[PDB]
Design a protein around this ligand. Structure first.
Ligand SMILES: [Cl-]
Length: 281
């Protein structure tokens, strides 16, 4: 892509060594790309590591069940989560993360720079490193989760949605006749439940296709520290709700159980600050 790998001198006796890693999780419908950047400033007491987490999480919007023509279930992704976590015994600390706060915009973007003070600062502080964050979240919201020096996590959760001019609806919508009409195609149509689900092409590309995260986590590591190797766990995660259409005696009625299924993908990475390398275990 536009993300280069290699080593550049970004000035003031500072080097940016960048590499990449890829792991396919075909079971969970996940391609998990990681671009890492070692910012080694000879004038700073700490080496910096930017872990740009990328790839694709397929939405896997699909009809999973059918009981005659009066009942059917639907699995739809209600949340995409990326998390990074450092075990407790480690010396390394999470100094910074992007997005830094909640993002309600359908598009997020940020260009990461190094300010030669040991601080990575995002704008949308002088010279750029090779990363410009960009991701899209139609009908979705981004939320930061319990950030500490040992764990950071982003949660891209479903917000609201217009349903062929009926909407807007969310996971909590209710109607005394039709219940939750989120993905309900027709209110009184004559067809099998399996066929009365909204076309995913008429909705968020996070539902039909999927979500492509682009988050940066910054890790600081003291040079004088004894143990100069570090483990870090990176988790990609999909939460899928269960939307069921049941034919009542008169009309169609929808229900939505939250967070019924959660598919969790996890990889461990060895960080070597001296060799400035990142590898899978
Ligand atoms: Cl209504």
């Amino acid at each position: 892509i536009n993300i280069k790998t290699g080593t550049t001198d970004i000035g003031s006796n500072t080097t940016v060594k960048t590499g990449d890693l890829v792991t396919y999780d075909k079971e969970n419908g996940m391609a998990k790309k990681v671009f890492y950047s070692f910012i080694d400033d000879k004038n700073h007491n700490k080496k910096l590591l930017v872990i740009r987490t990328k790839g694709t999480i397929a939405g896997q919007y699909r009809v999973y069940s059918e009981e005659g023509a009066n009942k059917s279930g639907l699995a739809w992704p209600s949340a995409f989560k990326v998390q990074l976590q450092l075990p407790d015994n480690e010396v390394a600390q999470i100094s910074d993360y992007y997005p830094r706060n909640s993002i309600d915009t359908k598009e997020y973007m940020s260009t990461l720079t190094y300010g030669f003070n040991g601080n990575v600062t995002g704008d949308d502080a002088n010279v750029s490193i090779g990363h410009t964050l960009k991701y899209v979240q139609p009908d979705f919201k981004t939320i930061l989760e319990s950030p500490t020096d040992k764990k950071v996590g982003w949660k891209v959760i479903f917000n609201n949605m217009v349903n062929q001019n009926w909407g807007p609806y969310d996971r909590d919508s209710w109607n005394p006749v039709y219940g939750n009409q989120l993905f309900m195609k027709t209110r009184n149509g004559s067809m099998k439940a399996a066929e009365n689900f909204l076309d995913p092409n008429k909705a968020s590309s996070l539902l039909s296709s999927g979500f492509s995260p682009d988050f940066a986590t910054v890790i600081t590591m003291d040079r004088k520290a004894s143990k100069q190797q570090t483990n870090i766990d990176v988790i990609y995660e999909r939460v899928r709700d269960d939307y069921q259409l049941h034919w009542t005696s008169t009309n169609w009625k929808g229900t939505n159980t939250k967070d019924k299924w959660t598919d969790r993908s996890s990889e461990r990475y060895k960080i070597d600050w001296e060799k400035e390398e990142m590898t899978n275990l």
